[PDB]
Amino acid sequence: GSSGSSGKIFTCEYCNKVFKFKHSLQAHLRIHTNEKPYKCPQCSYASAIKANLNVHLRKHTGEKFACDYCSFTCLSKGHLKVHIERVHKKIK
Template sequence: EPGSSLIDEVGLSGVSSRWRLLINPKPAAEGVKTFNCRYCGKIFTDSSNLRRHTMIHTGEKPFKCPQCSHSSNRKGNLIAHIMSVHRKLSETVYISTDPTLSKQK
């Protein structure tokens, strides 16, 4: 029967609203240009969001850490990496090499 699917058979009771939206996304407003992911079919109304999303499927990680081999598909994730890994490392190196900090008064 048209429109029937395993999801329809199982039903959506107990499924969070977020998952319902992923299963049955709301259509874009009439006249709004949409961009579809060729890998999973997810629909976007902004081409830059589609480009960013596509990196999840392709594995592309254009944001490279200048201090190690880490790379990310999001600039914010790279900044978080640098702050959590390299900032602590530089603080540790600074503390361990500063002779004034090792002297007790």
């Protein structure tokens, strides 16, 4: 059986949210530090690389492709063919 008389719980000091593990709190605290340098001017997105921010910024002028079998959408017809082959067909 389990050791001790009680468990342990982890809590945010900035928004009072509660987490089951310390690693979940450490990953949550990233929103309160907001330390990623390359921030999007259009949305809440941020990056550690200017080239990776450029790979994000092109999505604000992108176009979606939609599934014929479900409600799914993605930003490439090649990615859509690979969605269909995995989710609606058998994998080759």
